[PDB]
Amino acid sequence: TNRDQESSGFAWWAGNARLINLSGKLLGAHVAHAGLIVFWAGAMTLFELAHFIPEKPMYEQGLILIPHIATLGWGVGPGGEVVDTFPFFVVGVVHLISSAVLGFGGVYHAIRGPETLEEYSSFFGYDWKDKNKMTTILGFHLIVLGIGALLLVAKAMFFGGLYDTWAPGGGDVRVITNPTLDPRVIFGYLLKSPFGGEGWIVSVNNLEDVVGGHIWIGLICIAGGIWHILTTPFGWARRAFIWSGEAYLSYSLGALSMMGFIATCFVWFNNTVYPSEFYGPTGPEASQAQAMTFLIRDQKLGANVGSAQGPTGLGKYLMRSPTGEIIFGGETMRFWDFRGPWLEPLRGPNGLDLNKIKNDIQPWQERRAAEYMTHAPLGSLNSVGGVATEINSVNFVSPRSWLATSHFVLAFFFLVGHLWHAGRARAAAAGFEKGIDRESEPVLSMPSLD
Amino acid sequence: RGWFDILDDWLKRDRFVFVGWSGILLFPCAYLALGGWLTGTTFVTSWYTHGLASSYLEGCNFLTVAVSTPANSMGHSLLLLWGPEAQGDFTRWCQLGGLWTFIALHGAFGLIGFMLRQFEIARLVGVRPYNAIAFSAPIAVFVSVFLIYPLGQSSWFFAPSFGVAAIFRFLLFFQGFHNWTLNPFHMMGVAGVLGGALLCAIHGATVENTLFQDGEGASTFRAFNPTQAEETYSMVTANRFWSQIFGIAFSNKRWLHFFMLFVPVTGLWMSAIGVVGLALNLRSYDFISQEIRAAEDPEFETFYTKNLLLNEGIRAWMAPQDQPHENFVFPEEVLPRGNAL
Amino acid sequence: NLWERFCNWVTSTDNRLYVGWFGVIMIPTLLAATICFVIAFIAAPPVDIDGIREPVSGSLLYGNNIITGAVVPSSNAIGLHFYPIWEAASLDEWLYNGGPYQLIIFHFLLGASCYMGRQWELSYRLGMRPWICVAYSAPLASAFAVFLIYPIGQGSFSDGMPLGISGTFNFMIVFQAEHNILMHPFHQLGVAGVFGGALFCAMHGSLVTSSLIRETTETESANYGYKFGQEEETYNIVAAHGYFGRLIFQYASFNNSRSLHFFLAAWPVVGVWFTALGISTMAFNLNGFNFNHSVIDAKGNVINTWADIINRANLGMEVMHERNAHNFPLDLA
């Protein structure tokens, strides 16, 4: 049965390693785990909805899943205001039911179905060292991922659109009719620097680029899936990789760690696919909002904000970036690359325009600045809003903080897991994962260093 | 045989819990110290000694409970229950901080009993007593910090209170008032502690990654026999690995394990010496040349001068509440602060 | 074939220091970072770290000593912008804005990641088990947290840890002021990791030294009783297990040396993993526990706790840190 240490070589704390060469039970483990994921999605959505106050902003209510559905244009109107709550309920309920179905399948294949799929079928039975079968399964899953990307495209283009925080008038659910299919624009994001001002693919700032990139990634994933169904790994690929289950797991672990770090930076910096109406302001957004708020207040009191000198000699409200752009002064000089829909009407060719600052600041911009200043993504582990020195009065930690922290923890641990499994796959393929053979110790056959 | 020999035979009998002659000192004192800490953090306030809530009964959590030190006006009183301050009143004794002196003294004699236990068991089983010698460093730390440091100061009040957030207060107090990070003895202590953690991790990983294959199971923990005569890992392979990775490597196992003894013990002893220096307020607070230059030149700035400004902030902003016996009334206009914030 | 000969030299286990391909990346980056660090620590001009035209002197030639000297982080005006030498108009502008810090930290992070990879590589070439690099991933994660991840979360490389002793102390104190790291459970796990690592290091060393088998006289050192490459164990693990099992109780003592050494590896590595994650999660401003004004009496008066005294100390550091850099009431980043 391979369910003890003696017959399998693995202790109980590595007991899932007993599933490596048992395709049916491994499939059961995977399907049950997918059921767990869908279960969390549905149950968490229903939990969030049950404690959802529609007239309070989503980022004040500890919501991470409802903002995702809102970003898809479901249940929201202009300005991010919730107009209907039933789409959130539908998403949660359908995930809960589908998770029951997936849990049934996982349990069946894990404890009742055949332990190996090779005798039952040749289509579903696989060997880890059969490279063509591995590429065939990879191709099937690439086609599925491409269809998912095209499903996002279909939602954006034909099924109501997406929430656009950059939409003219204040942000609204908009149908994307002209996606950016230009490969220079799309693949210019991939060759952009990850550093300040550039920000790589995290810096995508319009839904047209998002939909065009998703068209490209859906078509590329479908094409690569067909490629791997039709082809076999080449000689350089066969010589460059370890071909085993733990090796493929380690490759996926490295990929997932990289994706986790990317998602952390995406939720921390991007306010386009993570609109600040739903997720709250970013840190740069909140700092710029504080500078804007006190600029407005002192300008109302009569200060000449263009000529006001701070304690150090720099501009108290307005200064210059290292490349000359007129930016907000103070420590928020670090955040001068921030772009937001509430701040862009005041920005001219040379940065913040003094004339627009003096007479074009509207009350909605001031309300947005005050709201984003007082909902900065700073909070305690017990969810006390503000800096670490604040007193207990405000129950607030930003969803951006929760998502970024959790996915950095997960991405780092998955990098560690990738290192573990990559080293172990190399050692097991080379044949010394269980230790050094006493009779054939390699170092004893090597010349001395000195 | 005699009553002494029969009693010695009983005390040294093999049990689940060894007692020994040292047990008579260890088990009462250690049990009372632990029970006093739990009793204090569960039921006893600091309202009359510090003006603080410090028990679960007052609504504090595990991080914020403490058995606080006695009030400053008590001085270095032993604060015995029958002593002239409490006069046998257990309730007043708890309210006056007598539980702190109870825990501190019972803990000191419990640590003495534990090192005597180490010596006694080492003598009984026939091993060298290097564990007691290693345990001298925690005893030195406890004596320097909880006994020598308040004895140098005005009272028991400035000793650490037995609690998590109270110990954090002790850390921040030493930063603000002593500049304890700048003290080279504390630097040697940090070096010893972090080097001991490094040596622990690196030696464990090196042993686990140079194991001989002594079994067919993938989980290698089964392959070790406690009574086997052979080494369970390859010292030659480990030496070559670290020689080619780091440049230098251990080649003597006995020297390796003595070094693992030596590093954190020496670090803790150096930090205890520094704590005695701080008991007399003999701080490594300032570099005189940098002070002279910064005083005569308002453009000279280092991270050390910034740390001094931070220490001034710590002292001014925490002194009225951390030292309520001084009756510090600092008006808002005398508080040092930067622009805005 | 020349490329085959170069590959054989690079992966050779007969070199005094192993190179490997992780080494062909590691050696130039670490040499560049080391040379730039020595030159900057000795002779760099003062650096405007806060971006407020108040340069901080960090090198020995400009009035520092070993304790107070540092390589000062790059300017807050730079923020997260990439600032190589060729992006400056001159070397004097590059030195004024803190370019050496960026050069050193980027080269050091690349070199240390390749050091981890090189540890794996040599373990693979020698037929070892491969997880020494996993143990080294904990200090590497700590270095990434303090040099890269905290600047990324705060939005400026000026908030990264300075390359010096007193600058490190400044980093610690300001971090406690703004994030209450002491009240964060990940840092408490890290303190448990390092304290336990020192404890178990001293414990394992004292237990092995205690149970050393007599192979010498009182004249000579006991270390000469061990010979390099001997098959027999130099100490009696049964005697040490008997001693430690009588010290606490029997089942608290390891009798398996492999399990014991795995525990020695695992405790500080997991603790330092959690404290590096603590620094990163406070970089995204998920701060330590806030218990200020938590205890309230019947009328509503605030009853102070030790957390409130910590809050007073944090307030002192907060109001005094970067005393000229703030124009607005909230220190958002």
């Binding site: 001395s448 000195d450 | 030496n239 | 020995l60 390099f228």
Partner: peptide, 30 residues
């Protein structure tokens, strides 16, 4: 003279690093 002292001690440390790595006692298997 203080800067010279610090740099001299550091240089002696680096020289000791060189001698400890490349002119060590060679570990001989026995």
């Amino acid at each position: 003279m203080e800067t010279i002292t610090y740099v001299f001690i550091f240089a002696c440390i680096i020289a000791l690093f060189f001698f400890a790595i490349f002119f060590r006692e060679p570990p001989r298997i026995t």
